[PDB]
Amino acid sequence: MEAIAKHDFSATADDELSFRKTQILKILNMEDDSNWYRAELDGKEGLIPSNYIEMKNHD
């Protein structure tokens, strides 16, 4: 499973994952939290805004 996120931001709280625009992020679980999503990166897990990403699986 893959999801993209284009926004270069620097998180506010420590449990807020920062990132770069157009980054390719790994997604862990989607469903009980449409607005808040749990993504993964290099092995580290974290909280972020699902609104800065979109599914790259149109097909």
Short mmCIF file of C-alpha atoms in Angstrom, two decimals:
data_model
loop_
_atom_site.label_atom_id
_atom_site.label_comp_id
_atom_site.label_asym_id
_atom_site.label_seq_id
_atom_site.Cartn_x
_atom_site.Cartn_y
_atom_site.Cartn_z
CA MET A 1 0.00 0.00 0.00
CA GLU A 2 1.26 3.42 -1.04
CA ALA A 3 0.02 7.00 -0.60
CA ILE A 4 1.50 10.36 -1.69
CA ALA A 5 1.56 13.68 0.24
CA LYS A 6 2.41 17.05 -1.26
CA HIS A 7 2.88 19.75 1.37
CA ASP A 8 6.32 20.86 2.76
CA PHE A 9 5.46 21.45 6.43
CA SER A 10 7.13 21.27 9.81
CA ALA A 11 4.85 19.64 12.43
CA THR A 12 3.74 21.45 15.60
CA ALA A 13 3.61 18.78 18.36
CA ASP A 14 6.12 15.94 18.64
CA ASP A 15 3.39 13.38 17.87
CA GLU A 16 2.78 15.41 14.71
CA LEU A 17 4.78 13.99 11.80
CA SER A 18 6.46 16.58 9.61
CA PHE A 19 7.33 16.09 5.95
CA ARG A 20 8.05 17.42 2.47
CA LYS A 21 5.73 18.08 -0.45
CA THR A 22 5.45 15.25 -2.95
CA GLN A 23 6.90 12.69 -0.54
CA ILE A 24 6.04 9.00 -0.90
CA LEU A 25 4.72 7.69 2.42
CA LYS A 26 3.85 4.19 3.65
CA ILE A 27 0.36 3.84 5.11
CA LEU A 28 -0.47 1.51 8.01
CA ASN A 29 -4.23 1.43 8.67
CA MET A 30 -7.10 3.38 7.08
CA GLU A 31 -10.73 3.35 8.24
CA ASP A 32 -11.59 4.30 11.82
CA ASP A 33 -9.87 7.65 11.18
CA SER A 34 -10.70 9.39 7.88
CA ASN A 35 -9.23 12.76 9.02
CA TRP A 36 -6.23 11.37 10.93
CA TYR A 37 -4.05 8.70 9.40
CA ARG A 38 -1.22 6.48 10.60
CA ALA A 39 1.67 6.46 8.15
CA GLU A 40 5.11 4.89 8.19
CA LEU A 41 8.59 5.94 7.11
CA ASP A 42 11.96 4.18 7.28
CA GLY A 43 10.48 2.04 10.05
CA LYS A 44 9.31 4.92 12.24
CA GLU A 45 5.53 5.21 12.71
CA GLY A 46 3.63 8.46 13.17
CA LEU A 47 0.45 10.58 13.06
CA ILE A 48 -0.36 12.95 10.16
CA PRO A 49 -3.09 14.68 8.08
CA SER A 50 -4.78 12.46 5.54
CA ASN A 51 -5.75 15.68 3.77
CA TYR A 52 -2.14 16.18 2.59
CA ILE A 53 -2.25 12.84 0.76
CA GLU A 54 -4.20 11.01 -1.91
CA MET A 55 -4.34 7.40 -3.14
CA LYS A 56 -2.17 6.90 -6.24
CA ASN A 57 -4.32 3.98 -7.45
CA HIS A 58 -6.81 5.26 -10.01
CA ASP A 59 -6.56 2.39 -12.49
#
